[PDB]
Symmetry: C3
Subunit: 403 residues, 3 copies
Amino acid sequence: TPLEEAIKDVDVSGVLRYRYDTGNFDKNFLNNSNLNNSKQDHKYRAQVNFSAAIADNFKAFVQFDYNAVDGGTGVDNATNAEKGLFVRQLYLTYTNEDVATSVIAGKQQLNIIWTDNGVDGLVGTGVKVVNNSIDGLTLAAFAVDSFMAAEQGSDLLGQSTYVGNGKNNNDSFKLDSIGNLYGAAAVGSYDLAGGQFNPQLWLAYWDQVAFFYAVDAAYSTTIGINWTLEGAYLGNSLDSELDDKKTYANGNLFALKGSIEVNGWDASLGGLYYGDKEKASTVVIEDQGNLGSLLAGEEIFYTTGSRLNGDTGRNIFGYVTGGYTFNETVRVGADFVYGGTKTEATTHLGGGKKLEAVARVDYKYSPKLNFSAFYSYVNLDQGVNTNESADHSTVRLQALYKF
Amino acid sequence: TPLEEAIKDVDVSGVLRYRYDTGNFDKNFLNNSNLNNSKQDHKYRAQVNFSAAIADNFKAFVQFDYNAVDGGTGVDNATNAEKGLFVRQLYLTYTNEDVATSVIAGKQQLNIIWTDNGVDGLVGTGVKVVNNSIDGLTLAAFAVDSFMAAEQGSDLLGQSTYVGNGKNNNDSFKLDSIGNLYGAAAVGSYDLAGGQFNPQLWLAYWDQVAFFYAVDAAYSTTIGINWTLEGAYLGNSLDSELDDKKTYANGNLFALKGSIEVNGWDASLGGLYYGDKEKASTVVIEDQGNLGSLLAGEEIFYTTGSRLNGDTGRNIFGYVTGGYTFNETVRVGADFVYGGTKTEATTHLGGGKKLEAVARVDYKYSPKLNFSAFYSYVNLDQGVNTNESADHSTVRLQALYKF
Amino acid sequence: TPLEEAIKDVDVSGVLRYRYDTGNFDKNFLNNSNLNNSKQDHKYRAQVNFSAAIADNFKAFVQFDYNAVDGGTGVDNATNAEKGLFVRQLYLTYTNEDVATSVIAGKQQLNIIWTDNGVDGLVGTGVKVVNNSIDGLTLAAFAVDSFMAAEQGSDLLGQSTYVGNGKNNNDSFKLDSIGNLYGAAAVGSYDLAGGQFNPQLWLAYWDQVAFFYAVDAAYSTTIGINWTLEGAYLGNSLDSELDDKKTYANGNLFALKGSIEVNGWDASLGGLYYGDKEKASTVVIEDQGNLGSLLAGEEIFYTTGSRLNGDTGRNIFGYVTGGYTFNETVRVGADFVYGGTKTEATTHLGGGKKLEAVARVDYKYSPKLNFSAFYSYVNLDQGVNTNESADHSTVRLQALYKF
Ligand SMILES: [Ca+2]
Ligand SMILES: [Ca+2]
Ligand SMILES: [Ca+2]
Ligand SMILES: [Ca+2]
Ligand SMILES: [Ca+2]
Ligand SMILES: [Ca+2]
């Protein structure tokens, strides 16, 4: 078929993202597989998605991914990525409009509350059933048979490590094997008179790991002023393979945030409570799940003992953010996060007071092209040697194009 | 050039195929590199072909292939294919319409009678000359200089193995080296009054291997009943590198099939005779060549001693098939195959009676999109321990889109 | 977005090139990593370039590369390239027309005078600033932070080797490490009354290697006759890491060529002088840089001691070329090159008189599609055993499509 013709049944979207990241560390800082260790690297992430109508009620979707690094520093003057595109997602979508339901089967980015829903979200193979028969309500069941785990490295539960006690790869949350994942979801979006309300309810059973359960709600509204409030609880109870190890513990997390917009000024205040002093627990499956609206900073929740994807210790944190937006074009702003981790100091690492300040610029050049930067300073009250404390700077420049 | 413009000299076609295969085996079953060993794997095979008019009388062709597997079972919950596209075919086509002839040079899927002509057909580099000056007759010469062997694994002659005698990789047909391939073909398609007649004659010399020669003919009829009859002989005589090894033997194969269609019922009866009791011989070069219309079942001709691409043993098999077709849309049907292999029990394995039954569903959703499934049960009268017999089940679900 | 739409902001170009090369050698020939050692190989090089307008003043560019080989001979009857596309260039271009300047940042083919500017040109990551404010003058500064070195193999300075003294990998120019590259360029194109004048001036500092400096000028003109004259000097002075090794030496090269066109006849005469009798020096960074207009033959400047990208020995060569062009369509022509290398015979290899004759056909089938061939015979007055001399033939057939 003439390509001119073939492309008419096709839709394209994607992402092009560049990153110049440099992360530094005091010798006393508790480093691990999740903190930013870039050394003036140029990083590329490109994704191109094609969706094609292939028959009545059937679309096919593919995503191509380019994930590559070029060096700057030292011997990295020869590191220059010679890489190709990889098929990252490949799946079929049956849609029946009469019953406002879709079946999506294949290798797909999961986009559940316990995984990143953006560029680097966990991908697996399985089936998703999604219903929109009710006004303002999305109902879904899903089953995953396998996970694209290698690509995710230390983003995935059970694949994070940390430094300490003369070993670079102490396992943050040992997971000897994994099963299939089964779950469901209800996700509401409603116009009250006052404004929009977004409740969410998530259940899943990950065989050999845990039964997860979560609720999250957001209210948002007008008056020229805008304010949102958002809360969430995520908990899980362990499967018996972990329960019998004795050194794991059912997860709990509480988080709340409120925020304000007026005249270009924006600000937010929020906090959260999670983990267990003595035993390993997790909040999410991959990275920080879909909880970004209930977080702040960049690095602080990657410190040892404070990671949301497996770690040991009890965490309390509060944060504030603020920024001004010149002409709806450039935003200068900052984040401040403060809190701590409690551990059993005899057996586990990362306990103590922690803080982070972040300065930010976000420049909206066009509706599709943004440039952004941040400077993050993180301080640990007690480092490798717990008597002294420890610094960790991270600087990023970023270009990001969406299409 | 604007891409909009550039694509006007371009033509696209391809394939998307999904497969959920699970193959199981009695501990007593004779396993080898060709039987189905899938363990609830999701298998993707995608091909996209672009053909561009580059100048007067010249087209260029490329094919991109994605061949990947995702796990289901056990430790395969982490196996999830992180693969890219590979250039599978790249060739030039000179066409002169005045002499109804085309010259096709490059890396190309061979599509000769001794290779699979479908998705997973053997690819090599060489030249093809094809003529359509005579009404209803296609004439061709061809020469191949190299073969895309690795991709084919055990589908290729000389690269199959089998289990037995405490060794997992007993070579089915040892081929220490290979030469170039040269051959020709005549392929007729004629409307007699009664109906269509399709004679074929194929010759080739594969240096260091064998001289192949084949004839195949099919008659089919029109209108409310329909019937086809199809026969074939494939033989080869060995090159002296194999003749002097003493343990090889010129190949012969005879096959015949007849079949009936009426009111949605269809049925077929057929049989075949091939191989040699004492010595290794082959029928085809890759997999089961283009002989699918003269076969039945799924697994039976992959049992040790019965493979069409190198094996020792003499084979006689008969088969019957049957099915009903609700609305020209869904076909439920079955295959029964029965026969045996005769060997020298002292020196070689796989001798004995063999059967296979297969249940089938074939659902034509659209002209481009088909879903199919099958359940195959294969029985070996004499297994690893030849005293007891042995089972082998295999189940497949399949989606297949052509464009 | 509908793809139909998305492709309107896009521009495509590229190259498809096929090569059947076979290079042979006397047992007495001095072989190395740069002479042609093909054995009836089919070679493919494809590049496809997409440039997209992404916002006001911003384009993005990507290049995909396919670089692959299929065998012919012996065991190479199984070598058949199973390769994919790789992202070879990925870069952003900011263009401000008000100041006739462009900033091009990313992974890009450098196209400086010291690298190949064609299909296989050295790629690195960095920034290029280019100005066209002056009539007939292009001004540029550039900085490179890393190099795509692996892809270039022995084309890159410091990665060539040679055979001799019972060792196959004697290093032609040992470079233990490399720094960043910084340079600038001025490139003129002017219509004098007589005809066009093309001066060029190139400076760069490659940290840990050398400071390079170059001038090149070309005059061309009418009188139905056409004649060009072109000269160049390339020199470099070493960085102290090489100066202190004592066995390296600042590079100098002089070259001059004049040439004639009339009635389909064309001819050229030229010569050059480079290198150092006792010590390793280089002229260019990758392959033969952009100096092809000042060279002739195919193989002779790849002989040991005569390579433009790192070698020991002093070289003088002269050459003549000539050809006739039937109908602006087919050119039959030849090259003759003659000269020598002076070395310290005690310590280094490749010294002696050398010649090359090349017969050529170049068939312009369309403005986009060319077929070409050459036969090259190279003779070394003194080979491995320096008493006897040594032959090296090289034959190429080539198809080359540009779009
Ligand atoms: Ca991730
Ligand atoms: Ca599974
Ligand atoms: Ca195959
Ligand atoms: Ca060959
Ligand atoms: Ca090169
Ligand atoms: Ca650098």
